[PDB]
Each structure stands twice: as structure tokens, then as C-alpha cells.
């Protein structure tokens, strides 16, 4: 009567449901609305009956019961700290100017499947100046992360396309391609990156490459190799190059290197870019630039829906157009440059010449080889059991070596983290 | 000769030097392996700092336009080359009364931002499935609103229903045979098709998705819209619901995907408990969404996985969450503060009124085509005596500044939506 939790019409229709289900109120067999009403309003019983009648528990004495057929988590799946992390995955709530982001969002509220046009135009403007990427906003597709866009691209590309990826390379993308039923050839690297020698031997249709900063090996692909790939694609129709530009704004000794696509004169390179390592933690905004022919193939689908929220897009635009973004990148560049030096100094201290640091002075990771003893597994297990998040290089197969990411590493925890690493590398006692 | 700006605009001296040198190397003006001046030689002959020349050469060297040899100097790298406008139809004409089924106002954007500020202060990737506490919040809500029974571990949040559906088809058996309502949600049909899946089509009767037809064809996975069939807004009676559930329970490896897209909006009765609330055998995959009930262009959706499809998901380990952590946390706060449910009640009434108004206006100017098929729920209904070919009514409508869609896409019929149509502009809309 108090109607706490549920109103009276809800309590009556819930009971009638339950009693219809248990068969206590048998098929085709109910009181008049007034009859049931006559210690509750007719309004209540009308509401109940309406419910029951909309749902199929009753049929239009008064009304009649429907006649419904009778009806014909494991511990290990449940979800269960003070960790230091050398993970290459994402960055951190470091020195992200979050107050300015919110301001831009505020402002953005005051102020299309491929993403909003003005946002696309804001991104296109940026990458022309920052990457030498040549495109019209019509060519850009925005997406909630690169994986969403890579899925779409595998559909826009021809169905039997043979993909070739870098070995070692980005395992996550190899998995996506593998899942999508594609044949994926793997191409070893030489000192210049993805080998055009083996791209010639094995014959693929679609290369996947990280020429600004090879993932994971950290090598920058020199222009001589870039031209060689660009020429290989330009002969024979239906050869494509997916350029995975995941970290190219961060180069510490030189200006960012113009994108592979900037040298393409034959519209064979699909430029894939991302803000996922540049904005707030947990936000994934990526984009890709389709050559005319693939934009057409997208155009003729027409059923795709945009994965980034409108307000997130507009916030990004405001961030870019206010100048806050360029300002942000410039500070972060300076902070990572220093965090990298500091990390490498600590590594040089603890390991001396027993560590070899590999890869370019760029991005948010490098590679680290160690003068033997233990297997990759030994180190990982040892490190796992010390609250240090680390990944071995063998993960990127498609003397033990690890990838060391420093994006989501706090500067305070560098020394402790390196010592934990040393402990892991050489498995010591107490 | 290298001309410099000196005005220093567009480009620093070092950038101008490396740009010019890149050009002369590329256009074979410098020829492979020839030496380039000492740093000091070039800095004096150009009348600039040696620093500038140094930065310029350091660029050249990192990118492979030059190479070094100790003591000897810097040389032009040897490079090959090949010799092998956007089409007008791909141009984007960025320039009407909408009766589209796919609400910019009425949303309490200020409470949203308050929840955002509240979330950003308490907190600040996190988890492939979505943040745990966000899943827990959604799980509580749908228990109460939908009768859905699950633990947050079974939940996968996604940036819209397409991303979740794509993932689901990788979790399900590879050769699984799907079955869809006919007519149905075309977008979802294309996706299934694009994944190379066999998809059977199942006709409707007065009770929605035909169990007889399901029995005939023998699919493994149903896709159904039992709260409000899309497009023909038939509410699947509990009689038929029970039939589909028994089917899935009879035989292993049968699944029901419940696409719940608008169930929070029923105007004459309480929202109807999910098909999945009545399932006892964990065979229904509940797919829900906030997409028709939040900020205009925000897509957050979620699916609830039977423990075995969860298992398969956990055996992958490489999927990354598509909804931003900050938005998820905002949604959580928004939900837990009561603001969400508060906003749903207001919208329901506002949609109730606008719908009653819309048909009032629809019949007062028709009574010839005024057959309004579909139920008193959700955000769309149907309209089908005279008329020309279906494609024609769509043609004149385009001219008459009127976004309207034809049922053939899912005697001529039109689907009409009213979520994005102002109270102000109804009478003119009908007139057209």
C-alpha cells in the first residue's frame, strides 16, 4: 500500500504473470476490472490488465489467460595495486592539460559516418603541416581506435588480398588480420626496415609498415627503402601500403619525418594516424586517409556508422584550433625526451655494458638486449613476481630482449623500476 | 644556390636548408654519392650559423638522404625512382523536415558535464571489456529496468552496436548459421554478410519472428527485436517468446541475439521485460544501447555474454576497448546519481506527447493512407490508399525538403521516426 519499490498496478500485474507462468492460473480461464478492483482503484487494475494484454499474458467473464507453452559463473571467469610499468601500451595521466581539455569541451558544446566535416578538416590541416600528408577531408574516416579502422579497411580492400606484415611487427594487428580470414605473409627486416628483397620473393598485395619508427624494433625506414616500397606498389595494379603512423610526432633529435604517404605520387598508401598516444588516457581517436578508389568502395556501402562521439570530435577540433594541441605536443615531446634520457641513464648505471639499447631516439619505446644467462620466460616470470609490468620481444614474432615503453612510467619510479628489472634479468635473493 | 627567407617565417633556416637539399637530391640535381660541403664551408658560404647547418645535416642523415663516413665527410645517398584531383562524384556537398528514425535538444547537457567533472575528480585503457565499475553500474540498471540477469564480467561495452556485433560473430562458431527477421535491420544483415556468414531470413506473423519458419530452416543463431520489431513495430507476445526460448534450449549450440534498441520507451504500459529475463538456459545474448537516449552523437552500447562466449572472449586477450574511459566514467556517474533514469522518464513523456501530436496531425490531413502500423512504443512507426511507386514518394519528398525513408530498404509504405522532429514543425511535415 505504501508503494515502496513498486506501484500497485505493477504488483498486481507481476503476480498475475507469476501465477500464469506457474500454471496456477490455467490457460483460457480473469475477473472484470471492477470485480478485481472492488480494495484498489479500477485505474490500478486497468493498468495491470493493459500490461498483461500488451505482453500476451491475457486475451481480449472479463479477459482470458493466454495459453503459453511450458518451458522446455565459474570461479575462473570472475574478476579478482602498487605496480611499476615498462609497458608500451598507451601513455599516462602524466602532464595532460585536462583543464584546458574540459574548457575546449565546454566551448565545443557552445559552438556524418566518416566523422564531422569540420573535425576532419581540422585533422587534415594538421597532418598536411605535421606529416606532409596530402588529402581532402572527404578521404578521411575517423574511428574509435585503429582496430576499428583496420577492420573496415580489410573490407574496402579486395577480399582475397594477400597481406604482408613486418617480422617482428605489431602482433595485435597480425591477430586481427588472422581472425578476418586473411593470408598474412611476414617480411623480415634488414637494417633499413621491411625488406623489399623478401617483398619481391613472397608476393603480397598489401604491405603493413611502420616506417617512421618500426614497431617493435624502433628503426626509422630510410628514404631509399621508402622509394623502393613506393615503386613496388606503383607497378602492378591493386598493390597497397598501409602506413601505421602510431608515434611519429615524437622525435627527439630531429624534426618529425615526413610520412611515407607524403612521397607517394600514385595513391597507393593508406595513411593511418592516431591521437591515442597524444590525448587523455583512455581516449582512442584514430583516422585513416583513403586513396580515391577505396573512398569510392566506402561510398557505395553507405551503412557504416561513426564510432567516435560527436562531442569528442568537436572537443578535439577545439583543442587543435585553439592551439592547445600543438602546445601540448611540444611539452610532451620535451618531457618524453627527458624521461627517455633519465631512463637510459638509470639503465646504463645498473647494467653497465651488459645491456644493449636498440632503436631510434624517437617514440615511446626502445628495445633492450641483455648478456644472456636466463631465458625470456625466466625474466618475465621473475619480473611479474616483483610487480613490474614488462613484455618480452618474442610476443612480436608473427640473448633475451625486452621492449621497454616509457609513456605510462612515472619519473619517480624509474630507479626502483630499473633495479626490479636488474633483479628480474639476473634473478637474485634476499 | 640556396635562397634563404631570413624573415624566418614558415621555416627556420635549418629547415629551409634541409628542404632545399632534399629537393636537389630528389630531382637528381646533386647525383648519388657526391660530397656535400663541410658544415663550416656551407655555413660561411650561406652566411649562417654552423648550428643551423648541423641541424639541417642531422635531419638529412636521420632520414637517409645523406650518409656519414668518419674523417671523410658527408655524401648524397643513392636513391632510385619510378615513372609509372579528387573525382567530382566523391566531392562532399556540405550544404528540411526530418521524419528519420535515426534528439539534439531536451538532453540535460549541464548535468552531464557536472557528472563528467565529478567523475574526472574521483578518478584520473583500464580494461578491454570496459571499466569494471562502469559495467557493474550498467549491470545493476538493466537488472531493474530490463530484468536482465548477469554479472559485470559477462559485459562488453562498445562504441555502438556494430562493433559489438562484429566481435560477437568472432566469438560464435565460424560456420554458425544466422537467421534474421524479414523485414529487419538491414545494417546488421550487411555486416553479417560482409563477415562471410550464412544468414537465413525469417518471415514475421502477427506475433513477430516465425517459429514455424525457424523450425523449417535450421539456423544456429537468431537475431530478433522482441520489444519492438524493427521496422514493423510488432511487440513479440510472451507466447512466441517462450517458443523461441524453448528452441534454443532444445539442442546445443543454438543462440538468440536480442537486439534491444528502444525498450525504455513504451507509452501506454511499463517497459516490457527483456526476452532474456525469461531465459533459464543462458542462450540469449542481450545487446543493449544508450545510443537513442544520451547526447546526440554519443554511441555507447553493451552486450551480455553467456558464460561460454565469455570464455572464448577471454582466450583472445588482444581486443581493445572502443569507448573512452572518461566517457564511460561519466555514464557511470550519470547513471548512479539518478540523472539517467530521471532523464528517461522526461523523454518518454516528451516522446509520448510528440507522437500523439504527430498522428493527430497525420490523420487530420490523410484518412486515405492513414494506416499507422506498429505499436505505441519506441521512436518510429509505420505508414502505408493511392500513391505512386514507392521510389517516387521518396523522390518528391527529397524535393519538398523532407528526409523520409522507404520500407523496401528493410502497396507502398514509409517508416516514420519522430525522435528528431521539433514540436514546432509537425503540421508542415505532414503537409509535405
Coordinates of C-alpha atoms in Angstrom, one line a residue, chain A residues 25-366:
Chain A
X25 CA -4.0 -19.7 -13.4
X26 CA -4.6 -22.2 -16.2
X27 CA -5.0 -21.3 -20.0
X28 CA -8.2 -19.8 -21.5
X29 CA -9.6 -19.4 -17.9
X30 CA -10.0 -13.3 -15.2
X31 CA -12.2 -11.0 -13.1
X32 CA -13.7 -7.9 -14.5
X33 CA -11.6 -4.8 -13.9
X34 CA -14.2 -3.6 -11.4
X35 CA -14.5 -7.1 -9.9
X36 CA -10.8 -7.3 -9.1
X37 CA -10.8 -3.6 -8.1
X38 CA -13.9 -3.9 -5.8
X39 CA -9.6 -2.9 -2.4
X40 CA -7.9 -0.9 -5.2
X41 CA -8.9 1.7 -7.9
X42 CA -10.2 0.5 -11.3
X43 CA -7.3 2.6 -12.6
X44 CA -4.8 0.2 -11.0
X45 CA -6.4 -3.0 -12.3
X46 CA -6.8 -1.4 -15.8
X47 CA -3.1 -0.6 -15.8
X48 CA -2.2 -4.2 -14.8
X49 CA -4.6 -5.7 -17.4
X50 CA -3.2 -3.3 -20.1
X51 CA 0.3 -4.6 -19.2
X52 CA -0.7 -8.2 -19.3
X53 CA -2.6 -7.6 -22.5
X54 CA 0.2 -5.7 -24.3
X55 CA 2.7 -8.6 -23.4
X56 CA 0.5 -11.6 -24.2
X57 CA -0.3 -12.9 -20.8
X58 CA -4.0 -12.1 -21.3
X59 CA -6.5 -12.1 -24.3
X60 CA -9.3 -9.7 -25.2
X61 CA -16.2 -13.3 -17.8
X62 CA -13.8 -10.3 -18.5
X63 CA -10.5 -11.2 -20.1
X64 CA -8.8 -14.6 -20.6
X65 CA -5.4 -16.2 -19.8
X66 CA -3.3 -16.7 -22.9
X67 CA -2.1 -20.3 -23.1
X68 CA 1.6 -20.4 -23.2
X69 CA 3.8 -23.5 -23.9
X70 CA 5.6 -24.8 -20.9
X71 CA 9.3 -24.1 -20.6
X72 CA 11.3 -26.8 -22.4
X73 CA 29.6 -18.0 -13.1
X74 CA 32.5 -20.5 -12.9
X75 CA 35.2 -19.2 -10.5
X76 CA 37.8 -18.9 -13.3
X77 CA 35.6 -16.3 -15.1
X78 CA 35.2 -13.9 -12.2
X79 CA 37.4 -10.7 -11.9
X80 CA 39.6 -10.6 -8.8
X81 CA 47.8 -2.2 -7.0
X82 CA 51.3 -0.7 -6.4
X83 CA 52.9 -1.7 -9.7
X84 CA 55.7 -0.1 -11.8
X85 CA 55.2 -0.5 -15.5
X86 CA 57.5 -0.5 -18.6
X87 CA 54.5 -1.3 -20.8
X88 CA 54.5 0.1 -24.3
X89 CA 50.7 0.2 -24.1
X90 CA 49.4 3.8 -24.1
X91 CA 50.6 6.7 -22.1
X92 CA 49.6 8.2 -18.7
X93 CA 47.8 10.9 -16.7
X94 CA 51.3 12.5 -16.8
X95 CA 51.1 16.2 -17.6
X96 CA 48.0 16.1 -19.7
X97 CA 46.4 19.6 -19.6
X98 CA 43.0 18.2 -18.6
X99 CA 41.5 21.6 -17.5
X100 CA 42.2 23.0 -21.0
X101 CA 40.6 19.8 -22.5
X102 CA 37.4 20.4 -20.5
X103 CA 37.4 24.1 -21.4
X104 CA 37.6 23.0 -25.1
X105 CA 34.7 20.6 -24.5
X106 CA 32.7 23.3 -22.7
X107 CA 33.4 25.6 -25.7
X108 CA 32.8 22.8 -28.2
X109 CA 29.2 22.3 -26.9
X110 CA 28.6 26.1 -27.3
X111 CA 30.0 26.2 -30.8
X112 CA 28.5 12.0 -40.7
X113 CA 29.7 8.4 -40.7
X114 CA 33.3 9.4 -41.6
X115 CA 33.3 11.9 -38.7
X116 CA 32.1 15.5 -38.6
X117 CA 33.3 17.5 -41.6
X118 CA 35.0 20.4 -39.7
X119 CA 36.8 17.9 -37.4
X120 CA 38.0 16.0 -40.4
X121 CA 39.1 19.3 -41.9
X122 CA 40.9 20.3 -38.7
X123 CA 42.8 16.9 -38.7
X124 CA 43.7 17.2 -42.5
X125 CA 45.0 20.7 -42.0
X126 CA 47.2 19.4 -39.1
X127 CA 48.7 16.4 -40.9
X128 CA 49.5 18.3 -44.0
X129 CA 51.7 20.6 -41.9
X130 CA 52.9 18.0 -39.5
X131 CA 53.3 15.0 -41.8
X132 CA 53.3 16.3 -45.4
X133 CA 50.2 14.1 -45.9
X134 CA 48.2 15.2 -48.9
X135 CA 44.5 14.7 -48.8
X136 CA 41.0 16.2 -48.9
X137 CA 38.7 15.8 -45.8
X138 CA 36.4 13.6 -48.0
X139 CA 39.2 11.0 -47.9
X140 CA 39.4 10.8 -44.1
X141 CA 37.5 8.2 -42.0
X142 CA 37.6 8.9 -38.2
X143 CA 37.2 5.9 -35.8
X144 CA 37.4 4.9 -32.1
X145 CA 40.9 3.4 -32.4
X146 CA 43.0 1.9 -35.2
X147 CA 41.5 -1.6 -34.9
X148 CA 38.0 -0.4 -35.9
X149 CA 39.6 1.3 -39.0
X150 CA 41.7 -1.7 -39.9
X151 CA 38.6 -4.0 -39.8
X152 CA 36.8 -1.6 -42.2
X153 CA 39.9 -1.4 -44.4
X154 CA 40.1 -5.2 -44.8
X155 CA 36.5 -5.0 -46.2
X156 CA 37.2 -2.0 -48.5
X157 CA 40.3 -3.8 -49.8
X158 CA 39.7 -6.8 -52.2
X159 CA 38.7 -9.9 -50.3
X160 CA 41.5 -12.3 -51.3
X161 CA 44.2 -9.7 -50.8
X162 CA 47.4 -11.2 -49.5
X163 CA 48.7 -9.1 -46.6
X164 CA 52.4 -8.9 -45.7
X165 CA 53.4 -7.6 -42.2
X166 CA 56.8 -6.8 -40.6
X167 CA 58.6 -9.6 -38.8
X168 CA 58.8 -8.8 -36.0
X169 CA 55.7 -6.5 -36.1
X170 CA 52.6 -5.4 -34.2
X171 CA 51.1 -8.7 -33.1
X172 CA 47.7 -7.2 -32.3
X173 CA 47.2 -6.3 -36.0
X174 CA 48.5 -9.7 -37.1
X175 CA 45.8 -11.2 -34.9
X176 CA 43.1 -9.0 -36.4
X177 CA 44.1 -9.9 -39.9
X178 CA 44.4 -13.6 -39.0
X179 CA 40.9 -13.6 -37.4
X180 CA 39.4 -11.9 -40.6
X181 CA 40.5 -15.0 -42.6
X182 CA 43.3 -13.2 -44.4
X183 CA 46.6 -14.8 -45.5
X184 CA 49.4 -12.9 -43.9
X185 CA 52.9 -13.2 -45.2
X186 CA 55.7 -12.0 -42.9
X187 CA 58.6 -10.0 -44.2
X188 CA 61.9 -9.9 -42.2
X189 CA 63.6 -6.6 -41.6
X190 CA 67.2 -5.6 -42.6
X191 CA 69.0 -2.6 -41.3
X192 CA 66.7 -0.4 -43.5
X193 CA 63.4 -2.0 -42.2
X194 CA 60.8 -4.1 -44.0
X195 CA 62.8 -5.9 -46.7
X196 CA 61.9 -5.1 -50.3
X197 CA 64.0 -8.2 -51.2
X198 CA 61.5 -10.5 -49.5
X199 CA 58.5 -8.4 -50.6
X200 CA 59.7 -9.3 -54.1
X201 CA 60.3 -13.0 -53.3
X202 CA 57.0 -13.6 -51.5
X203 CA 54.4 -11.7 -53.5
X204 CA 51.8 -9.9 -51.4
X205 CA 49.1 -7.4 -52.4
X206 CA 49.1 -5.2 -49.2
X207 CA 52.0 -4.3 -47.1
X208 CA 51.6 -3.1 -43.5
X209 CA 54.5 -1.0 -42.3
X210 CA 55.7 1.4 -39.6
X211 CA 58.3 3.4 -41.5
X212 CA 58.5 6.4 -39.1
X213 CA 59.6 4.1 -36.2
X214 CA 59.4 0.4 -36.8
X215 CA 57.3 -1.5 -34.2
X216 CA 58.8 -3.0 -32.2
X217 CA 62.4 -2.8 -33.5
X218 CA 62.5 1.1 -33.5
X219 CA 64.3 1.5 -36.8
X220 CA 63.5 4.5 -39.0
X221 CA 62.9 3.5 -42.6
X222 CA 65.4 5.5 -44.8
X223 CA 64.1 7.3 -47.8
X224 CA 65.9 4.8 -50.1
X225 CA 63.7 2.0 -48.8
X226 CA 60.6 4.2 -48.8
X227 CA 61.1 4.9 -52.5
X228 CA 61.7 1.1 -53.2
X229 CA 58.3 0.3 -51.5
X230 CA 56.6 3.2 -53.3
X231 CA 57.9 1.9 -56.6
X232 CA 56.9 -1.7 -55.9
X233 CA 53.4 -0.6 -55.2
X234 CA 53.2 1.7 -58.3
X235 CA 53.8 -1.1 -60.7
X236 CA 51.1 -3.8 -61.0
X237 CA 47.6 -2.6 -60.1
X238 CA 45.9 -3.4 -56.7
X239 CA 49.1 -3.1 -54.6
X240 CA 48.6 -1.1 -51.4
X241 CA 50.7 0.1 -48.5
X242 CA 49.1 0.6 -45.1
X243 CA 51.3 3.1 -43.2
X244 CA 50.7 2.7 -39.5
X245 CA 51.8 6.0 -38.0
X246 CA 51.4 5.4 -34.3
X247 CA 54.0 7.7 -32.7
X248 CA 55.7 9.9 -35.3
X249 CA 55.2 13.3 -33.5
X250 CA 57.9 12.3 -31.0
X251 CA 61.3 12.5 -32.5
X252 CA 63.9 13.8 -30.0
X253 CA 67.0 14.8 -32.1
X254 CA 65.3 15.8 -35.4
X255 CA 62.0 17.3 -36.8
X256 CA 59.3 14.7 -37.3
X257 CA 60.0 12.8 -40.5
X258 CA 57.5 13.3 -43.4
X259 CA 55.1 10.4 -43.8
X260 CA 55.7 7.7 -46.3
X261 CA 52.5 8.8 -48.0
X262 CA 53.9 12.3 -48.5
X263 CA 56.3 10.9 -51.1
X264 CA 53.7 8.7 -52.8
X265 CA 52.7 10.1 -56.2
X266 CA 50.5 7.1 -57.1
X267 CA 47.8 7.0 -54.3
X268 CA 48.9 3.5 -53.1
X269 CA 49.5 4.5 -49.4
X270 CA 46.7 4.3 -46.9
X271 CA 47.8 6.7 -44.1
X272 CA 46.6 5.5 -40.7
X273 CA 47.1 8.1 -37.9
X274 CA 46.1 8.2 -34.3
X275 CA 45.7 10.5 -31.3
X276 CA 45.6 7.6 -29.0
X277 CA 49.1 8.3 -27.6
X278 CA 48.6 12.1 -27.7
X279 CA 45.4 13.0 -25.8
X280 CA 43.9 11.9 -22.4
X281 CA 44.4 8.4 -21.1
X282 CA 41.7 6.0 -22.2
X283 CA 40.6 8.1 -25.3
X284 CA 41.0 6.4 -28.7
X285 CA 40.6 8.6 -31.8
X286 CA 42.2 7.4 -35.0
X287 CA 41.8 8.2 -38.6
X288 CA 42.7 6.9 -42.0
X289 CA 43.2 8.6 -45.4
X290 CA 41.8 6.6 -48.2
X291 CA 43.1 6.8 -51.8
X292 CA 40.2 7.8 -54.2
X293 CA 39.4 4.2 -55.3
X294 CA 39.0 3.0 -51.7
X295 CA 36.9 6.1 -50.7
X296 CA 34.6 5.0 -53.6
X297 CA 34.3 1.5 -52.2
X298 CA 33.4 3.0 -48.9
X299 CA 30.9 5.4 -50.5
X300 CA 29.0 2.6 -52.1
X301 CA 28.5 0.7 -48.8
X302 CA 26.6 3.5 -47.1
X303 CA 25.6 1.6 -43.9
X304 CA 28.6 2.3 -41.7
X305 CA 28.1 4.3 -38.5
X306 CA 30.7 6.6 -36.9
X307 CA 32.3 5.2 -33.8
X308 CA 33.6 8.4 -32.1
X309 CA 31.0 10.6 -30.3
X310 CA 30.2 13.9 -31.9
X311 CA 31.2 15.9 -28.8
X312 CA 34.5 14.1 -28.6
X313 CA 35.3 15.0 -32.2
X314 CA 34.4 18.7 -31.6
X315 CA 36.5 18.8 -28.4
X316 CA 39.4 17.5 -30.5
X317 CA 38.9 20.2 -33.1
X318 CA 38.6 22.9 -30.4
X319 CA 41.9 21.5 -28.9
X320 CA 43.6 21.7 -32.3
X321 CA 42.2 25.1 -33.4
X322 CA 42.7 26.8 -30.0
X323 CA 46.4 25.9 -30.5
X324 CA 46.2 23.9 -27.3
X325 CA 47.2 20.6 -29.1
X326 CA 50.4 21.9 -30.7
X327 CA 51.3 23.4 -27.3
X328 CA 50.5 20.0 -25.7
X329 CA 52.6 18.0 -28.1
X330 CA 55.6 20.4 -27.7
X331 CA 55.6 20.0 -23.9
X332 CA 55.1 16.2 -24.1
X333 CA 58.0 15.9 -26.6
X334 CA 60.2 17.7 -24.1
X335 CA 59.0 15.6 -21.2
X336 CA 59.5 12.2 -23.1
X337 CA 62.9 13.3 -24.4
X338 CA 63.9 13.8 -20.7
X339 CA 62.2 10.8 -19.4
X340 CA 64.0 8.7 -22.0
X341 CA 67.4 10.1 -21.2
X342 CA 66.7 9.6 -17.4
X343 CA 65.6 6.1 -18.1
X344 CA 68.6 5.3 -20.3
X345 CA 71.0 6.8 -17.7
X346 CA 69.5 4.5 -14.9
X347 CA 69.8 1.5 -17.3
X348 CA 73.4 2.4 -18.1
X349 CA 74.1 2.7 -14.3
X350 CA 72.7 -0.7 -13.3
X351 CA 73.6 -2.8 -16.2
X352 CA 76.8 -1.1 -17.5
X353 CA 77.8 -2.7 -20.8
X354 CA 75.6 -5.8 -20.0
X355 CA 72.6 -4.0 -21.6
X356 CA 72.3 -3.1 -25.3
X357 CA 69.7 -0.4 -26.0
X358 CA 68.3 -0.6 -29.6
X359 CA 66.1 1.6 -31.8
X360 CA 65.8 5.3 -32.7
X361 CA 65.7 8.4 -30.5
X362 CA 62.0 8.6 -31.0
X363 CA 58.6 7.4 -29.9
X364 CA 57.7 5.9 -26.6
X365 CA 59.7 2.7 -26.6
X366 CA 63.0 1.1 -27.4

